[PDB]
Design a binder for these strands. Structure first.
Lengths: 117, 64, 146, 205
RNA sequence: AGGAACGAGGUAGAUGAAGAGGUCUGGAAAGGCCCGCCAUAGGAGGUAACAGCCCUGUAGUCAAAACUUCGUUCUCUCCU
RNA sequence: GUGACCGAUAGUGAACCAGUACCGUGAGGGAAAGGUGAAAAGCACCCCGGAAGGGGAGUGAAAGAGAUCCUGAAACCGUGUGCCUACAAGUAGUCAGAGCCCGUUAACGGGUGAUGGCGUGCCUUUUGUAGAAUGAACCGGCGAGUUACGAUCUCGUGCAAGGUUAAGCAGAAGAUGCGGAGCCGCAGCGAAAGCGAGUCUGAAUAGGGCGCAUGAGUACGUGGUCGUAGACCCGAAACCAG
RNA sequence: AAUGACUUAUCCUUGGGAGUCAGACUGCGAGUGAUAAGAUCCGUAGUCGAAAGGGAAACAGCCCAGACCGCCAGCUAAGGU
RNA sequence: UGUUCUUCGAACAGUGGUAGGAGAGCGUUCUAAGGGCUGUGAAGCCAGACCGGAAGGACUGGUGGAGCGCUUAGAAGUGAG
C-alpha cells in the first residue's frame, strides 16, 4: 500500500519551532535555522552546565579573598590556615555566606591566624 | 533465471569431499628445458585452491 | 491457537534492515558502502571472476579434461543398509527402490562392503565389491550378478 | 479425549471416543502460526501495479540543454524527482503463494483440532437432521446448543439443506469434511462436526 | 458439399420476506437503551448521521416476438 | 465480479468540454484545473456606494457556509498590547543575573530582560573547512537500497540416514487431497576405463595427495550477502534505426 | 627462543558482513635537495584523522589530560598567582 | 553494558568516536483477530508551564463536522534539510 505521511513531519517541525521560541528574527520562525540554533543551544547548554561549576567557584574565591584581605591575610594563607587549624572541610560558598553572616567569617579567620605562627 | 556456472572454472577446477577444491599447477605445458626436474615432479602433482582464492571463486562454482 | 494474539517463534523472524533512513540508526548517508568508490556506485562493482586486471586464477591454470559420454553410476548400497530387512528374502533393486533405501536407479546397483551384516540374505544386484561378496558369503548368503 | 455426544433434542445420553492420534496430541504453537501465515498469504490477489519511469506517457527528449542555463541537468521530462512520477521500485504484481511441507500441514490441522478439543469447543451432532431448507430451524438448532458466537458446521456428505441454510448467518460457515483448514478452525472458535465427518477425517488425516 | 425442429445461454425484463416498534439526543436517526421478525435473500448503492426488515435492490422461481452461440434428432448427401 | 491497489503533486497525459489550451513551418511536444448546503431553500427588504464591495434584516443546524464554495497549516503581509531598546561592534545562542508584567497540565512557575562569562551556522568533500572550497531565497508537497528467479550463511520449525514433489487434475482463480516424474543427501578417489573404506600416482605388499576412520542432511519461513535483471537515485557528450 | 615465578585477559581456527589503497604534523634516524622549504621519500613513537576539556592571545597535529548524565562538592596535571 | 557470586539481587569493571559491523526500539499506510470511542462531537488544525533515556506519547481549551482508534500478528509506494 501507499504511505503518504503528512502529519508527523509537521509535528516534528512544530516541536522544533516551539523549542526555538523567543529567538531573534527568522530563527524563531523558519525551521531550517531554528533546528541549527536548537542544536547549537544544546551544545552551549552542556558546555555552560560544565562552566557554571567553576565560575561560581572563582566568584566565591574572589569574595573570600576580599573578606580575608579585610582581616590582614591573603587567600592562600587563609586556606593554608584552614587546612592546618584542624581538618575543617568548610566549603567556600558557605564561607561566602559567612560574610553575609559576619562576624562568623572573622572567627574562622582568627582560627586560621592562631596556628599559622 | 537460474545461476549460470562459470564454464572455464568448471573445466579447470574439481570439487572434492568438502572441499578445498582440486586444481592443477601452472608452468606445466611449456619450456621444460629451463626448469629443473625437482620443479617438474612437483608441478605435475595436484594442489588445493587457497582460502583467499576460495572466498572469491566459490560463488562461481555453486552448481558444480 | 488463539487468533487475536499470534505470537511468533523466538528467533524465527527478524526485522528487515532499513538502509539510508537517517544517521542515528547506522547505514545512514553512505548506506554502508563507504565514500566515492566503484563499489559505492549503482550497478556494481566488478565481475566475481575479476582481479582488477591481473590475470585471474582460472586463466593461470590449465584445463583438466575430460568427461566420458557414457558413464554409469553404480551407487550406492552399503552393508548396514541391508540390516533393515527382518529377516529379508530376495533383495532386489526393484524391491530396494520401493523400500526407500534407494532413491533412484542409475543403470544398476552396486553393493559395497562398508559396515557389517549379521543375517541370512538372498542378494541380487548388478555388481559387487570384493569385500562385500566375501561378507555375504561368510554369513551364508548368496550373491548373484544380474 | 472424552467428548460428550449431542443429538440436538435432549441432548443427549452417550458419548463418542475420538482418537488421540488426531484430537489428543500436544499442540505445536509455531506450526499453527506458520500455517496461519501461509494460509493468510495467497488469499490476497497481489494485483497492485504502478508505472515505472519507462512506462509513464512522456517524451524522451531533454527539456533544456546540459550546460549554459543556470538550472539543473534534468535529462528526462519525467524523472523520479519530477511531478510526472516518480517511482523507481513501486509495488509490482506478484504471487504470495508458498507451500509448507506436508508433515507440517498435517501437524497443524491435528494440533489445532486437539487444541479445540481441550478447550471443550467441539460439538458432535449425528447426521444433522434438517427437515426443511429454512434458516430459522438452523438458528433454533444453534440456539439450542447455546452457541452465540461464530461457529463451523462440518458435513461429510455435503447436504444441500445444510449448505443453502446457515450461509445468511454472518458468523456461521458450512464446510465439507475434506474442505477443513487452519483459518476456519482458528477463526470461529467452535465447530459442529458430524460423526461421519469425524470418521472421514480420522482416516483422511 | 445444402436445411427443418427440440434443450440450454446472450442482446431486454418481471416477480421476489421481514419494523412508522417504543423512548433519548439531534436539523435530520441509518446512532444508544429496551424489544420482535425474515433469511436459498446479512452482495452493494442511495435515503437529512453508521439500514437487514425505507427505495433501487440481492438469493431463488422464471420469460423470449426478432437476431445469434452451442448440443441432440431428422431430412439430405457420400461410401466396399 | 475481486483487490493487505491509488485517492486529486497520487491513480491513465487526461476523475473537470484532454490529446484540450498552448508551443513548433512540420514531424511532434504537451499542461494546469474535483468538493456550498440534505434540500438554492443562491441573502426578499433597508442604508452607504456609479458599480464592485460592505453593515443590518432573513433562509439555513452552521453565512467565519455566500459561488476556486468542507477543514483550513507554514512561508508572507498587517493592527493592537506586556517587557526591553538612541555610548553601542554582536554565528545572534547558552549560563549567571536585578528590575518590571502575569498566573500554569502548581510545577525548585511563565514572558521580557539592563549587565557579565563563554561561544567563528548546517551539509558535502578533504591530511586539514568559520572558510575567501560546494549546495540551499523561504515554506509546503513529491523525491533514492525495492521486486522476480537462483546461490551461500545464521536463526526457527517439521522429519531424520530420507527429506521433498514440480507441472497437472479436483477444489470460494483459497486452504488442502491426489500426483515420487524428478532434486539433494546417504563414503569417495581417479583425466578416464574402473575400483571402493578406499582410491590415484607409482615396479612397490614403499612414501605421498584426497576421504571415512573421529558420522547429518532435507523442505520451507525470517534476516545478512552475492549473481542475472535499468538493480541505489539523478546526470552526459555521443551512436544507430525510421 | 627456553623453564621457574608475579601480573594481567588476551590469543588461534572456521564461517557471515565490511570499509580502507590521497594521509598530515611533531620528536628522533637516513636519502634527494643547497644536511633550503609548511619540500619529497622512508623507518620509528605520539597526536590529529576519528578527541571534546585546560594551557600555548588567537592556532587539526605542540604540552597536560580521554566528554553516560546531573551537583552552586573537594584535590590536582600542564601553565600560572 | 560485561564478568563473578547468585541469599529479593549485590559487588567489581566499563560506557569520546569517523568508515564499518552487531543488537534493542519509536513512528506512517493497509489487512486479520476482540473491544471500544463517536454528532451528549471522529480524523485533521491551533495553543499550553504534562509524561517517557530517545525516536515519541497523553490530557485539557478552541476550530471542525464524520469517521477513528486499541490489541497480537502480518505486508510495505516506511520517516526528508
Amino acid at each position: 500500500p501507499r504511505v503518504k505521511g503528512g502529519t508527523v513531519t509537521r509535528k516534528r517541525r512544530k516541536k522544533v519551532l516551539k523549542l526555538a521560541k523567543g529567538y531573534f528574527g527568522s530563527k524563531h520562525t523558519l525551521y531550517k535555522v531554528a533546528n541549527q540554533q536548537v542544536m547549537k543551544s544544546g551544545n552551549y547548554a552542556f558546555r555552560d552546565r560544565r562552566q557554571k561549576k567553576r565560575d561560581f567557584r572563582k566568584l566565591w574565591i574572589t569574595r573570600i579573598n576580599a573578606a580575608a584581605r579585610m582581616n590582614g591575610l591573603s587567600y592562600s594563607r587563609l586556606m593554608h590556615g584552614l587546612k592546618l587549624s584542624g581538618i575543617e572541610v568548610n566549603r567556600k560558598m558557605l564561607a561566602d555566606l559567612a560574610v553575609n553572616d559576619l562576624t562568623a567569617f572573622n572567627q574562622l579567620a582568627d582560627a586560621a591566624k592562631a596556628q599559622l605562627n | 533465471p537460474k545461476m549460470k556456472t562459470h564454464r572455464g572454472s568448471a573445466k579447470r577446477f574439481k570439487k572434492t569431499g568438502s572441499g578445498k577444491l582440486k586444481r592443477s599447477h601452472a608452468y606445466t605445458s611449456h619450456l621444460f628445458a629451463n626448469k629443473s626436474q625437482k620443479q617438474k615432479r612437483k608441478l605435475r602433482k595436484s594442489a588445493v585452491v587457497s582460502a583467499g582464492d576460495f572466498k572469491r571463486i566459490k560463488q562461481m562454482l555453486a552448481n558444480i | 491457537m488463539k487468533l487475536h494474539e499470534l505470537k511468533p517463534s523466538e528467533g524465527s523472524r527478524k526485522t528487515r534492515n532499513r538502509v539510508g533512513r537517517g544517521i542515528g540508526s547506522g547505514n545512514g548517508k553512505t548506506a554502508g558502502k563507504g565514500h566515492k568508490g566503484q563499489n559505492a556506485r549503482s550497478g556494481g562493482g566488478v565481475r566475481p571472476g575479476f582481479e582488477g586486471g591481473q590475470m585471474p586464477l582460472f586463466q593461470r591454470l590449465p584445463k583438466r579434461g575430460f568427461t566420458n559420454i557414457n558413464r554409469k553410476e553404480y551407487a550406492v548400497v552399503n552393508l548396514d543398509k541391508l540390516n533393515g530387512f527382518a529377516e529379508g528374502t530376495e533383495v532386489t533393486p526393484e524391491l530396494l527402490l520401493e523400500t526407500g533405501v534407494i532413491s533412484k536407479l542409475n543403470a544398476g546397483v552396486k553393493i559395497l562392503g562398508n559396515g557389517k551384516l549379521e543375517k541370512k540374505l538372498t542378494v541380487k544386484a548388478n555388481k559387487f565389491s570384493a569385500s562385500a561378496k566375501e561378507a555375504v558369503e561368510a554369513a551364508g548368503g548368496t550373491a548373484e550378478v544380474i | 479425549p472424552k467428548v460428550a455426544l449431542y443429538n440436538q433434542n435432549g441432548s443427549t445420553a452417550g458419548d463418542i471416543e475420538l482418537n488421540a492420534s488426531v484430537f489428543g496430541i500436544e499442540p505445536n504453537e509455531s506450526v499453527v502460526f506458520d500455517a496461519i501465515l501461509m494460509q493468510r498469504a495467497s488469499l490476497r490477489q497481489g494485483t497492485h501495479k504502478v508505472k515505472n519511469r519507462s512506462e509513464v506517457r512522456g517524451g524522451g527528449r531533454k527539456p533544456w540543454r546540459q550546460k549554459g542555463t543556470g538550472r539543473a541537468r534534468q535529462g528526462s521530462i519525467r524523472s523520479p524527482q519530477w511531478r510526472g512520477g516518480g517511482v523507481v521500485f513501486g509495488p509490482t504484481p506478484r504471487s504470495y503463494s508458498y507451500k509448507l511441507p506436508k508433515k507440517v500441514r498435517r501437524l497443524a490441522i491435528k494440533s489445532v483440532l486437539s487444541s479445540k478439543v481441550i478447550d471443550n469447543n467441539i460439538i458432535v451432532l449425528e447426521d444433522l437432521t434438517l427437515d426443511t431448507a429454512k434458516t430459522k430451524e438452523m438458528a433454533a438448532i444453534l440456539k439450542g446448543l447455546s452457541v452465540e458466537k461464530k461457529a463451523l458446521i462440518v458435513t461429510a456428505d455435503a447436504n444441500e439443506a445444510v449448505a443453502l441454510s446457515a450461509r445468511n448467518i454472518p458468523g456461521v460457515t458450512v464446510v465439507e469434511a475434506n474442505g477443513i483448514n487452519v483459518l476456519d478452525v482458528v477463526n470461529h472458535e467452535k465447530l459442529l462436526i458430524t460423526k461421519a465427518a469425524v470418521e472421514k477425517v480420522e482416516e483422511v488425516l
